[PDB]
Amino acid sequence: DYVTSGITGEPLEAYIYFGPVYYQKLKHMVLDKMHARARGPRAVLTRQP
Amino acid sequence: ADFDGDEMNLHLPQTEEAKAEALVLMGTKANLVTPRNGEPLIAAIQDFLT
Amino acid sequence: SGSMDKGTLGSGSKNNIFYILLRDWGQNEAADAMSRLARLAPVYLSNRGFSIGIGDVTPGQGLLKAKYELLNAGYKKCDEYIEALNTGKLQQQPGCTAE
Amino acid sequence: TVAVMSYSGYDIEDALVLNKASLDRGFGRCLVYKNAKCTLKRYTNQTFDK
Amino acid sequence: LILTRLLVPPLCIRPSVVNEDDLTMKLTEIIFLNDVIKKHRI
Amino acid sequence: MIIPVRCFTCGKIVGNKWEAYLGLLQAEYTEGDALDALGLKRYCCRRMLLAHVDLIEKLLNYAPLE
Amino acid sequence: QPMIYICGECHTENEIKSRDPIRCRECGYRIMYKKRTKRLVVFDAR
Amino acid sequence: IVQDEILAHRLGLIPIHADPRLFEYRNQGDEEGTEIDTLQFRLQVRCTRNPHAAKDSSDPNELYVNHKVYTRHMTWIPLGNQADLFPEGTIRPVHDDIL
Amino acid sequence: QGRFRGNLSGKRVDFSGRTVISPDPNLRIDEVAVPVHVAKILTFPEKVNK
Amino acid sequence: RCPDCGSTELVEDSHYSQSQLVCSDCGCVVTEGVLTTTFSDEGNLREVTYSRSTG
Ligand SMILES: [Mg+2]
Ligand SMILES: [Zn+2]
Ligand SMILES: [Zn+2]
Ligand SMILES: [Zn+2]
């Protein structure tokens, strides 16, 4: 397709490939993966974290 | 790394002596070239070459 | 003269312009030049536009003729060899047996 | 409704860019259910949790 | 070099709940068997 | 589960078309004629009705009911 | 005064207020669901 | 059976037919609001079985009454003097038909 | 899992984090961007002086 | 009792992850950090009756 830029307003040089594709969202989400430890419980046998 | 779902760690050195070594020795600026043969490793990647 | 490409901007080899800056002028110049390239290339290419579709993959006219011609010749020569072997007329290559 | 083009430089290696105003209208919205279970029992001695 | 006595290590290097560590169950068995011999020979 | 009110891509209000769409199908229009007679020009809108899967008609059979 | 539970099958309101076994007053079903809270909760339309 | 967050998300998207030039921006906080910068609507339905219904036991439309929640059921609740400033019928959700 | 290979040479440490990685071409090659929520957990014990 | 204040208003509280005992009266820490078992040794857990463990 012929496309116009949304920021400058002036038409792009190339013609852009446009259309419908089936996208699926996987179960890996960042909110379930962030982590950090300042200072916390220690093991009893060796007193490392 | 490739931003396809990767993960990376991070540590915060706790001593003024350890800050000085990390910055001077382990900084990126001091490590633009790999010690295997001296070729550059930090350079432009795809979509900057184009 | 010329144009910039992996051989002059990529992470492979010397002759990298960031490598020349590193050796001749220090670390700060090479680290700054890379940063400016990070900010300056995306602004060009993202307003020029650059795309791929199936027009960039469809085979043209002359290609079909060459492909058909080549396949016919190749199969005939393969036939000739297997004919040579199964008749036993095949000359053995001087490093191995007929197979 | 995807376009295949290079855009904005935050998309280099397998990263991709979404339209803020679609996320507001429902695209990619989801739900996450979790479970929590507990039980009360009677001990051999004649007493029980409460 | 030939041994006739042993040390039992402190409770620090073998916590309460392993119920107790296997080193504990080993040691209680050694003493049990030792007591068996001495009463048995007597 | 249920009909989204607005077309994700452009923002047109399509939530009020579902019942009419099934009505027009029930009169043996094709899908193409149905969408055209509802006035859904852009293809970003057409998928919004065309590819819907209405699960709330089914999920209700399992609901607690007197 | 006592708390009410909804039977899992016939939805007849029951009351326990006791250590009694969980069983429907009317039928044989043995599953109970608590009623919705009476307080209001505030949501954002976003 | 529609979860509350999802129901609230749906309600937001419905366009209201107020003219926006007559109202100020709500100040930060001040969640109680006042007649110069807020509007109120009320929604309330109870689905019940139709007693007159015959024995076909097939059509949901006949079997039940108010088994569908259209945007018709929202009633404007005038706040302050808004009932006087706005003539009747000029405050409503635009489409009257959304499900 | 023994002492030597598990607890003396390489061992667990604190004051560290872990997360997904994503792109940003507006950082200088020597900077890294950290989320606020992980900046609020980690600390550095700065001594007071003049 | 708080070593710094003497008052007995100690409240058990935790920050984002650390478990600690804090004098609520003055904002002082008196104890923190705990040693616990893990899941890795959880699977190895045995049991012995107190009768077996007491003869
Ligand atoms: Mg990867
Ligand atoms: Zn649309
Ligand atoms: Zn029942
Ligand atoms: Zn105190």
From Swiss-Prot, chain C:
Residue ranges of the TM segments: none
Tissue specificity as recorded in UniProt: Expressed in the brain, in the cortex and the white matter (at protein level).
Domain of life: Eukaryota
Subcellular location: Nucleus; Cytoplasm, Cytosol
Implicated disorder: Leukodystrophy, hypomyelinating, 7, with or without oligodontia and/or hypogonadotropic hypogonadism: An autosomal recessive neurodegenerative disorder characterized by childhood onset of progressive motor decline manifest as spasticity, ataxia, tremor, and cerebellar signs, as well as mild cognitive regression. Other features may include hypodontia or oligodontia and hypogonadotropic hypogonadism. There is considerable inter- and intrafamilial variability. Wiedemann-Rautenstrauch syndrome: An autosomal recessive, neonatal progeroid disorder characterized by intrauterine growth retardation, failure to thrive, short stature, hypotonia, variable mental impairment, and a progeroid appearance. Clinical features include apparent macrocephaly, sparse hair, prominent scalp veins, entropion, greatly widened anterior fontanelles, malar hypoplasia, and generalized lipoatrophy. Death usually occurs in early childhood but survival to third decade has been reported.
UniProt record similarity statement: Belongs to the RNA polymerase beta' chain family.
Protein name (database record): DNA-directed RNA polymerase III subunit RPC1
Span covered, complete protein: 647 to 745 of 1390
From Swiss-Prot, chain D:
Location of the protein in the cell: Nucleus; Cytoplasm, Cytosol
Origin superkingdom: Eukaryota
Annotated residues for binding of Mg(2+): 14
Family named by the database record: Belongs to the RNA polymerase beta chain family.
Subunit relationships: Component of the RNA polymerase III (Pol III) complex consisting of 17 subunits: a ten-subunit catalytic core composed of POLR3A/RPC1, POLR3B/RPC2, POLR1C/RPAC1, POLR1D/RPAC2, POLR3K/RPC10, POLR2E/RPABC1, POLR2F/RPABC2, POLR2H/RPABC3, POLR2K/RPABC4 and POLR2L/RPABC5; a mobile stalk composed of two subunits POLR3H/RPC8 and CRCP/RPC9, protruding from the core and functioning primarily in transcription initiation; and additional subunits homologous to general transcription factors of the RNA polymerase II machinery, POLR3C/RPC3-POLR3F/RPC6-POLR3G/RPC7 heterotrimer required for transcription initiation and POLR3D/RPC4-POLR3E/RPC5 heterodimer involved in both transcription initiation and termination.
Disease as annotated in the protein's UniProt record: Leukodystrophy, hypomyelinating, 8, with or without oligodontia and/or hypogonadotropic hypogonadism: An autosomal recessive neurodegenerative disorder characterized by early childhood onset of cerebellar ataxia and mild intellectual disabilities associated with diffuse hypomyelination apparent on brain MRI. Variable features include oligodontia and/or hypogonadotropic hypogonadism.
Name of this protein: DNA-directed RNA polymerase III subunit RPC2
Species annotation: Homo sapiens (Human)
Originating gene: POLR3B
Curated annotation (Swiss-Prot), chain F:
Keyword Cytoplasm: no
Cell compartment(s), UniProt: Nucleus; Nucleus, Nucleolus
InterPro entries reported for this sequence: RNA_pol_su_RPB10, RNA_pol_suN_Zn-BS, RPABC5/Rpb10
GO molecular function terms noted in the UniProt entry: DNA binding; DNA-directed RNA polymerase activity; zinc ion binding
Keywords, sorted A to Z: DNA-directed RNA polymerase, Metal-binding, Nucleus, Transcription, Zinc
Pfam families in alphabetical order: RNA_pol_N
Main location: nucleus
Any one of the GO CC terms: RNA polymerase III complex
Gene Ontology BP annotations: regulation of transcription by RNA polymerase I; transcription by RNA polymerase I; transcription by RNA polymerase II; tRNA transcription by RNA polymerase III
Record: residues binding Zn(2+): 7, 10, 44-45
Assembly: Component of the RNA polymerase I (Pol I), RNA polymerase II (Pol II) and RNA polymerase III (Pol III) complexes consisting of at least 13, 12 and 17 subunits, respectively. Pol I complex consists of a ten-subunit catalytic core composed of POLR1A/RPA1, POLR1B/RPA2, POLR1C/RPAC1, POLR1D/RPAC2, POLR1H/RPA12, POLR2E/RPABC1, POLR2F/RPABC2, POLR2H/RPABC3, POLR2K/RPABC4 and POLR2L/RPABC5; a mobile stalk subunit POLR1F/RPA43 protruding from the core and additional subunits homologous to general transcription factors POLR1E/RPA49 and POLR1G/RPA34.
Family named by the database record: Belongs to the archaeal Rpo10/eukaryotic RPB10 RNA polymerase subunit family.
PANTHER family reported for this sequence: DNA-DIRECTED RNA POLYMERASES I, II, AND III SUBUNIT RPABC5 (PTHR23431:SF11), DNA-DIRECTED RNA POLYMERASES I, II, AND III SUBUNIT RPABC5 FAMILY MEMBER (PTHR23431)
Species of the source: Homo sapiens (Human)
From Swiss-Prot, chain J:
Family membership noted in the UniProt record: Belongs to the TFIIB family.
Protein purpose: General activator of RNA polymerase III transcription. Factor exclusively required for RNA polymerase III transcription of genes with promoter elements upstream of the initiation sites. Contributes to the regulation of gene expression; functions as activator in the absence of oxidative stress. Down-regulates expression of target genes in response to oxidative stress. Overexpression protects cells against apoptosis in response to oxidative stress.
UniProt-annotated location(s): Nucleus
Signal sequence extent: none
The protein's name: Transcription factor IIIB 50 kDa subunit
Segments forming TFIIB-type zinc fingers: 1-31
Span of the entire protein shown here: 6 to 60 of 419
Annotated binding of Zn(2+), by residue: 2, 5, 23, 26
Disulphide bridges: none
Taxonomy, superkingdom: Eukaryota
Quaternary data: Component of TFIIIB complexes. The TFIIIB complex has two activities, alpha and beta. The TFIIIB-alpha activity complex is composed of TBP, BDP1, and a complex containing both BRF2 and at least four stably associated proteins; this complex inhibits the transcription by pol III via its phosphorylation by CK2; YY1 facilitates the TFIIIB-alpha complex formation. Interacts with TBP; this interaction promotes recruitment of BRF2 to TATA box-containing promoters.
Induction context: Down-regulated by epigallocatechin gallate (EGCG) treatment.
